[PDB]
């Protein structure tokens, strides 16, 4: 708004050559930039664009204190878990939204970039935890969790991989997910476009 001429680097989030594991996701902060949500809308949203608390149509004129971009890769059937009120392996152990979230979740099919014929095994996720994960919490440690009936200082009585291959139907294809979390009017707003 107040003579900001910088443009928001959405391309440095959305066009990235490498994406993070579900846990240890990339978290970038955008500030002191003019928003332009024309680009992130009906250009390349592909599969989905679901917002909570805002009407995407007028998103360019709202003005946020800060915008945070959480970026990661998940299996396609799990896309529905990146949403307020959801449960499951991603929602409970890897990435959780607050249920009063005011941002936008954008996702698309990356099978052509991430899947390999032999299988892309570089994407990991958390399967086990002693308790559920809190919103935006990150925990990247390894605990050889599967004690079963005996505490272990060995292996088992940790984390698991995804297997991404171009032919595993549809629900098993990888998806790139970007979550734009909005910090609205907690301090005078800094990021908007036309206003």
């Amino acid at each position: 708004f107040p003579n900001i001429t910088n443009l928001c680097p959405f391309d440095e989030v959305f066009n990235a050559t490498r994406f993070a594991s579900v846990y240890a996701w990339n978290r970038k902060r955008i500030s002191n930039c003019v928003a332009d949500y024309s680009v992130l809308y009906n250009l390349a949203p592909f599969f989905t664009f679901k917002c909570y608390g805002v009407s995407p149509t007028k998103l360019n004129d709202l003005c946020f204190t800060n915008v945070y971009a959480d970026s990661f890769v998940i299996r396609g059937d799990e896309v529905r878990q990146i949403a307020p009120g959801q449960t499951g392996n991603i929602a409970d152990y890897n990435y959780k939204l607050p249920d009063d979230f005011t941002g936008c979740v954008i996702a698309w099919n990356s099978n052509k970039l991430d899947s390999k014929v032999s299988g892309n095994y570089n994407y990991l996720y958390r399967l086990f935890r002693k308790s559920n994960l809190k919103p935006f919490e990150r925990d990247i440690s390894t605990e050889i969790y599967q004690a079963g009936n005996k505490p272990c200082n060995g292996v088992a009585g940790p984390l698991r991989s995804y297997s991404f291959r171009p032919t595993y139907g549809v629900g098993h294809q990888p998806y790139r997910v970007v979550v734009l979390s909005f910090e609205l009017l907690h301090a005078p707003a800094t990021v908007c476009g036309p206003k």
């Binding site: 680097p9 391309d11 440095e12 066009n15 990235a16 050559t17 490498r18 993070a20 990339n26 970038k28 902060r29 955008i30």
Partner: protein, 107 residues
Amino acid sequence: QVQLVQSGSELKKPGASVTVSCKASGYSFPTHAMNWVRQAPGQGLEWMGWIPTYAGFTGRFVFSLDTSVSTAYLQISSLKADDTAVYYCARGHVLEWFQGTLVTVSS
């Protein structure tokens, strides 16, 4: 999209060392991806090395980058060579993109 800027050229005598500059535009990162690539006079292009490592060639060409700016530091420990090549700075984070510079040695 992301542009790179490099010093246009360098010239120095054999036995001396040089450093080649590069900076990228951008705002933030968790990590780094980049490559130094060389184009010998009249040949195709060769990899010099990735984030400070080697392409298989070691010795004269070594390097150490700090960040997204001064992301460069290609260093030649010795100019006693016929390596009067064009060097390129390659961006590896959004869309691959190249910029380059000419480094020579006089007689």
